[PDB]
Amino acid sequence: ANEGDVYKCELCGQVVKVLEEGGGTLVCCGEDMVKQ
Amino acid sequence: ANEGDVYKCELCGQVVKVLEEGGGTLVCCGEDMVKQ
Ligand SMILES: [Fe+3]
Ligand SMILES: [Fe+3]
Numbered sequence: 806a807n808e809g810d811v812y813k814c815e816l817c818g819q820v821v822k823v824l825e826e827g828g829g830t831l832v833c834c835g836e837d838m839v840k841q
Numbered sequence: 842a843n844e845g846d847v848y849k850c851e852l853c854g855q856v857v858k859v860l861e862e863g864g865g866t867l868v869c870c871g872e873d874m875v876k877q
Contacts, residue, residue, distance in 0.1 A: 811860065819842065819863020827855025829870035833863065 806831065812838035842867055848874035 806812060810823045814833035821831070821838070831838040842848060846859045850869035857867065857874070867874040 806855070812857075814863050814865050817863035817865040818861060819859065819865055819867075820861035821848075821857040821859050821867065823855065824847070824858055825849075825854060825856035827850055827853035827869065829850050829853040829855050831855070831857065832868040833865035 806840065811841040813841055814838050842876070847877040849877050850874050 806823045808826045812831050813820045816834040842859045843862050848867050849856045852870040855869050
């Protein structure tokens with residue numbers, strides 16, 4: 806994802822902010838995190 | 842992970858910071874992101 810984006814896990818509610826972009830998909834609780 | 846924690850994907854270099862904690866394990870590029 807891109808620097809500054811915020812991603813949320815819909816199942817457990819964990820929210821992270823991207824500090825350094827990478828192209829990998831962020832996954833949490835067996836599912837792709839959702840860009841906010 | 843817990844609020845304020847920083848995690849890195851060693852494969853693609855993506856770095857995230859936890860804003861709201863959740864009990865799920867952060868995964869990127871198919872493996873567990875490493876706490877810094
Ligand atoms: Fe990755
Ligand atoms: Fe989760």
